[PDB]
Write a protein that binds this ligand. Sequence first.
Ligand SMILES: [Zn+2]
Ligand SMILES: [Zn+2]
Lengths: 310, 310
Amino acid sequence: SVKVFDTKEVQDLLKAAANLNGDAGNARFRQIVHRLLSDLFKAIDDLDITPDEVWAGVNYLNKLGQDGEAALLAAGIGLEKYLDIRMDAADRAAGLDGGTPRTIEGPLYVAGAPVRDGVAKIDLDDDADAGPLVIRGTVTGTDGKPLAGALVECWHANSKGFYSHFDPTGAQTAFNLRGAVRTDANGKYEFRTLMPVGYGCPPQGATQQLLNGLGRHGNRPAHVHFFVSGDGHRKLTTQFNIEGDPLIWDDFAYATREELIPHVVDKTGGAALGMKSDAYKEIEFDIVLTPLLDGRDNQVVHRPRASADA
Amino acid sequence: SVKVFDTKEVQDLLKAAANLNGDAGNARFRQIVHRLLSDLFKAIDDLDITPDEVWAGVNYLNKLGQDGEAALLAAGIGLEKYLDIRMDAADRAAGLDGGTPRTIEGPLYVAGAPVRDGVAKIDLDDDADAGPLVIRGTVTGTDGKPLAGALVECWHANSKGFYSHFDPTGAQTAFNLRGAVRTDANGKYEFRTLMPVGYGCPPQGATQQLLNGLGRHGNRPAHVHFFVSGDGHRKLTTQFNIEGDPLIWDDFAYATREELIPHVVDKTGGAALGMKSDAYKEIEFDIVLTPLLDGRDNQVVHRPRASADA
Ligand SMILES: [Zn+2]
Ligand SMILES: [Zn+2]
């Protein structure tokens, strides 16, 4: 067995490849690339990764991008959760850890949903196998005061586990099961929707291929995603899990938090809300936002996101 | 900046994501994934890589695979050269460092070229801007005796810097500038071709995008690729560079070696050889192969490769 990482030839190659001694340029980017390349080269050296293994990994990266799944893989190997862990640690160090917990966004947000006042009905497509669901709650700040005019956005899957704009069967209308509500004067919001079923990775796709190699499933428990925002407060990325889903603590993207599992309550009187049956389920999901730090939101995330027109 | 990498929560997440403790999955694959993931998480912690930075990297991985350029990036950030450095070290440790030096294959080999005995004309398409070139040499073993019936394959670019089967203009015939010759009884091979000009990355592609961010060019000096094989000997991947190219020691893929820069000789008498002018250039490139180690070729590489019919 041979080791070459700590040799002058290898260190010169890394310096050249990242252009550390180049003209003035993007020093931060060169610093990051040098670190990632150095770590990769050292891992190849330490584990004696063969050329055949490396070229299989290179081939995998081609498939990953061809499938458009790099952000799904980021969820599946815990990187997305890891970013939340680092934001959580920064919040604890600054006393901003008293609100509704964050969790991962996932890769399926779509911008452009219509904003309603107080109540939105977001099931645009018929879904016979999904029962009616009312999600409602109150938004407050950590101080305790309800927040009027706060913007509550949600998105979730249908009974086949698919999201609109990402449904491979093409069966969904634009913005089905996606919507936004401005809270009323008492901080209240309400979504009228249908019950989600859990998501699973595209079985032929790159993420599931890698999970298969690891001996891992690619499934998520049923859940609903949220963005919540409002004047004077930081933007919350969160979700809640559907109580009783047996995958709730075995999510392939590691998103579950014990504070984010509200009760599912059987109700009647559905016709008064325009639901499709008298019997329906209600989930009360109250949300607590944190104030800005020095007038700034130190944890909002910019990433590529889909958009569409109504 | 927070430091969370060493915490139990993060170490547990890494063990889960790579399924180190599961019964299922490929053991070697889980080990490699855990190492790469652990190193990535530590780098993010150490350099305080922001979520915005991480998601830009994720987006880049999508573009890289969409462009089909993972193998081109592997050459461009020195990973392909690095594999050669590790193979060279193994050969030194085993006493097998006495042949013509290896260099990188690159991503543009195509299997299927018609095999000729002794001499092959490989410029099938006219190319007015490239002058005539003869490449000839003798294949020997490390003992200095000629190897008869050894297979010498070469491939190189036209005057526009493009290879057949990878020419985005579609202008080249199958196997243009791609040869395969079996050496004669005296070990000799000869190719009659045109002079290559250097390759450059697809300018809108992912590899050049990353190089642009580093402040690096994506150009190669003019060169000719070789595979050389023969019974009882290991398969050699190598190249030679055209003497005098201004980029000869500034290859973006770091492939140049001092032993692989043969002298270019001005000749006359081209018409008798079937060349398009009386004056032509000649390059003598002798090749030394190494015998098998314990009956096996311990350095042959299996990677995805194109193929075509003549
Ligand atoms: Zn989801
Ligand atoms: Zn080349």
